[PDB]
Amino acid sequence: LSSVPMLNVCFNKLFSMLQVHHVQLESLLQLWLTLSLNSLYNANRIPVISLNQASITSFLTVLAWYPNTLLRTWCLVLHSLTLMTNMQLNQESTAHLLVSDPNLIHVLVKFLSGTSPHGTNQHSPQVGPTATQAMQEFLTRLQVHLSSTCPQIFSEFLLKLIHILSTERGAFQTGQGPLDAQVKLLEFTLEQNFEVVSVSTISAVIESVTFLVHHYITCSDKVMSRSEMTRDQLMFDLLKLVNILVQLPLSGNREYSARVPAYVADLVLANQQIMSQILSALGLCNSSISVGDGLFTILTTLSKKASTVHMMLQPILTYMACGTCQLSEPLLWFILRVLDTSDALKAFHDMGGVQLICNNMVTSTRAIVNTARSMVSTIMKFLDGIHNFAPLGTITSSSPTAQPAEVLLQATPPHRRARSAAWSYIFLPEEAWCDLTIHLPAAVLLKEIHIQPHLASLATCPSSVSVEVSADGVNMLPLSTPVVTSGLTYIKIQLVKAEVASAVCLRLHRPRDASTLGLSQIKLLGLTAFGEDQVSKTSIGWLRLLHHCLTHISDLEGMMASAAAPTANLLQTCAALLMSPY
Amino acid sequence: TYMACGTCQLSEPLLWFILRVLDTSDALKAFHDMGGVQLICNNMVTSTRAIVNTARSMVSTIMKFLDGIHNFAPLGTITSSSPTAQPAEVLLQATPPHRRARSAAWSYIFLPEEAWCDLTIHLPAAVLLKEIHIQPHLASLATCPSSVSVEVSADGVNMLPLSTPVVTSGLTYIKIQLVKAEVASAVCLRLHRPRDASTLGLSQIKLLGLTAFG
Amino acid sequence: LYNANRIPVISLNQASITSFLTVLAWYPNTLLRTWCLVLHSLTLMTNMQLNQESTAHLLVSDPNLIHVLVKFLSGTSPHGTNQHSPQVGPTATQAMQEFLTRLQVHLSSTCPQIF
Amino acid sequence: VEDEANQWSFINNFTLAHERCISVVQKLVLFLLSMDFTCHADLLLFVCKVLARIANATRPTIHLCEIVNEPQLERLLLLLVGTDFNRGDISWGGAWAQYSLTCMLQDILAGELL
């Protein structure tokens, strides 16, 4: 006398008739989850209402059709899909059915894209730890249900989802979407096995992710706000994922073939775009958990799992020739490491490497002038260690304030009690930004701005501040996006590139719930004209290259040095660089 | 065609527009000519058969007393997933003394690995929650949370988020209103680590809403 | 001192302007420093005269100006580790508004249709 | 008395014959289906509460197969989740009545599976 079959019939009728927009989706899903949980949430709980394949596909396609799906509804969807993994069908598996159709791709893309057109406060698109745990439980149940039958389709499904998400106008590229969900799925993808997955989608995803990471590295920001977990960890985790990926050997017809002895490092070696992208990304990274460490590790493992050393020297010399050329500390260490063996030096000499190197030193020595301080600066510096320059300059504002802001320009004002504020600003209802223009008597090599708000009551701290620099003092010009400093006791705006500036405009935004601004002290740190990585990009790196070539192994140093000899003006240039302090 | 194809959705601006577009005599004549009034009558019959009255009847009045938005935080209890140095029940008071704000009413210390801490408030019964009030430390709001996410659960067991975590850094008073009042019995406030502070300081948490008969 | 009414002393060429515009539309992750510099340069490109079609009609006719303005107003910023608020600030908005005002002035007499 | 010797606590802030309980339960369900604008929501909450209490109190627990047929259960389901009665902020009976319907159905299902 069980009423289960007639209720199953009624819910399948409802699931077929919801297509005409006659049933609310959120109410239907919440009620079906509540009636199926009566046997506290758990991923191991079996729902008591067994559903139908047509019902599941109709629900999935109406979910993929529905845009601006809220996160309340999204977590409800994730719990319902976990239950859809928990069920059994009445002989293919339900997980294979869920994975096979691209509708699951579309729903997961809508979830992880984190669009939220509804959000008037599109602040941080993260979906929170509960939703990330629910999605992780869903993916874990998917691997468990598809491990016995066919992990091929599950691993291909995950790689296709990441690849489509990582293409042009994707969630990883544009930066929108839940950062926590993306890093939890990626660290979930780390533990997966890709031992049957097709080489085509693997090549597509590796090209897409290398293009995206190279475009992010080469075109990075000009400032960084210093305070956790950020998108730096996302790049670190993606490079770790591809470090796992390139270590996978492929066996067979190089198609639908990994099978736990060629490797895919050769496949990414045949791609010229990827080698140019990764060497360029290593070209503009600083030396000593970081992106440069990650790039060094992925290239090291690419060299280790590679079969032939010839395929190691070909991309290196094509990048150095096609680059004048960009030569960094990780690139110098990699060139020294790949030229470790005797056969490496022999192959490098065989296809014309040393003569190109000599031409590069001649062209770079004729190219770059010395930037070091000479004797003239020493013997003129005194005839008339980062120092402050705020007391030297003056301050002004575009609006008539109740008090002048010159108190902010002191070298160190007394900060012991902080009675009201050192400087205060009152906001009109129409305006939101106020500009403090600081004019220095001379342009200085500005490096970092320090802004101290009121320490006793930092409710009056600006919600956001934009720093703008001008070298001539007249052509007013912004530096970057206004940085949010609400809740920050100390504001440190460092510059990766030190800028010659004579006027500095601090445009402060209205605070989130305060109409007054209170500030203590403004510092202007930098250098004046006469007050490791700086030598690597010069010809010294190439000189180290020649020294390692001619001194690492002495048995091959002669005939190859005889090839290095008849280049024009080699000895004069060597003597001139030896006479230099460098 | 919109009223027929919609059961149908009829709002205040739509009522005013329908009254305004039916201002002229020719408008009424054309509305009657292509069958408008009969469809209207069918809509009242279908809606009257459809929607039950939501008004409070005499039963609620004559049972309400046999046993204006009010606070519900003092009735419930509080807990956290991590062992804190002090319990957060001081936050649950109806009005704690906020005159000096010496250090904080409640404080939380962050481990380097964690960034979120959850305050779960369990009410004795589910209430029609309408708006959350979070007051950080007023003397030094550097310890105010950078962002806070409010999550509601009606049954008290099926933990479930409400929306995206709202950024409250630089906010003296946190007012999270709900356009839709939600029947909730457990409320989780997941607070994020502040931008440059490792400690959280809070004064008072309010839980505003109604009851079934209040 | 910058002004939208200042006439630049170096008169440029049509092929030069089109090549510059297409290499700007090709270049992604264009920073806002560089974007405000671009807007000032394009204001100057509206200020110039060609040596007999107008330069504003030439700037408007090709879809490369559409692509550059779409890259500017889309506010992608893949570089931003702090994608907080994509606003470009009052100075850049004033520069773009001056550019559009110079475009209407230069195309009002000839053909406001295309603008 | 049975407690001292929880889902319906939102109001306060023995052995029974099988046939008459079944009859009064199905008549209460037919009363539920005949709820129009004359009937109110508080009466709905109280009949849901007394339905759950009689369903759990009777030995053995009355199941839904002998309570509703297919059309009655279909009407109840479309009443619970369809947007012909759950459209807008004036969803059926309000959130309190929806919660009460969910609790009565959950109680009857839990009584069925003991």
For residue B118, is it left (φ>0), alpha (ψ between -120 and 50) or beta?
beta
Q: Using alpha carbons, select from A399, A361, A338, A388 the residue that is nearest to residue A531.
A: A388
Q: B142: distance to nearest CA of chain D, Å?
A: 40
Tell me how the structure was determined: cryo-EM
Phi–psi pair at A445, nearest 5 degrees: -80, 85
For residue B175, what are the β-bridge partners?
B133
DSSP label at A474? S
Alpha-carbon distance A526 to A448, whole Å? Answer: 7
Phi–psi pair at A301, nearest 5 degrees: -70, -25
State the Cα angle at A433 between A432 and A435, rounded to 5°: 155
Identify residues after which chain B is interrupted (C–N over 2.5 A).
6, 67
Q: A289: distance to nearest CA of chain C, Å?
A: 16
Identify residues after which chain A is interrupted (C–N over 2.5 A).
39, 90, 227, 260, 288, 323, 384, 531
**A578–D contact, CB cutoff 8 A:** no
Taking the CA atoms of A146, A192, A40 and B132 in sequence, report the sign of the dihedral they define. Answer: negative
Identify residues after which chain D is interrupted (C–N over 2.5 A).
5, 13
Contacts of D64 in chain A (CB under 8 A): 3, 7
**B182–D contact, CB cutoff 8 A:** yes
Alpha-carbon distance B122 to B151, whole Å? Answer: 12
CB C81 within 8 A of CB A231: yes
Alpha-carbon distance B172 to A73, whole Å? Answer: 31
Would you state the torsion angle of the CA atoms of residues C68, C71, C72, C77, taken in this order, to the nearest 10 degrees?
Answer: -150
Peptide bond into D60 cis (omega under 30): yes
Do strands B199-210 and B116-136 pair parallel, antiparallel, or not at all (unpaired)?
A: antiparallel
Count of A–B CB contacts within 8 Å?
96
For residue A285, is it left (φ>0), alpha (ψ between -120 and 50) or beta?
beta
Mapped onto helix, strand or coil, the DSSP state of residue A479 is: coil
- Structure resolution in Å? 7.0
- CB-count burial class (<10 Å; 0-12, 13-18, 19+) for B111: exposed
Half-sphere exposure of A106 (CA within 13 A, CB side): 13
Least CB-CB distance to D70: which of A10, A28, A38? A10
DSSP label at D66? T
Least CB-CB distance to A128: which of B146, B190, B197? B190
Alpha-carbon distance C106 to C57, whole Å? Answer: 8
State the Cα angle at A294 between A288 and A296, rounded to 5°: 75
Q: Which chain D residue is nearest to residue A32, measuring alpha carbons? A: D81
For residue A263, what are the β-bridge partners?
A249
Q: Using alpha carbons, select from A335, A364, A329, A300 the residue that is nearest to residue A546.
A: A335
Q: Which two tokens stand for residue A170?
A: 């994707």
Give how far the C-alpha of residue A534 lies from the chain's centroid of Cα atoms, to the nearest Å.
25
Q: Which chain D residue is nearest to residue A17, measuring alpha carbons? A: D82
Instruction: Give the 3-state DSSP-derived string for A503-571, with helices as H, strands as E and coil as C.
Output: EEEEEEECCCCCCEEEEEEEEEEEECCCCCHHHHHHHHHHHHHHHHHHHCCCCCHHHHHHHHCCCCCHH
Q: B118: distance to nearest CA of chain D, Å?
A: 26
Q: A562: distance to nearest CA of chain C, Å?
A: 45
Alpha-carbon distance A365 to A534, whole Å? Answer: 15
CB C32 within 8 A of CB A481: yes
Longest Cα pair distance anywhere in chain C, in angstroms? 48
Considering only residues 47 to 86 of chain A, which have any Cβ-Cβ distance to chain D shorter than 8 Å?
Answer: 48
Q: Do D11 and B52 touch (CB under 8 A)?
A: no
Do strands A387-388 and A423-426 pair parallel, antiparallel, or not at all (unpaired)?
A: unpaired
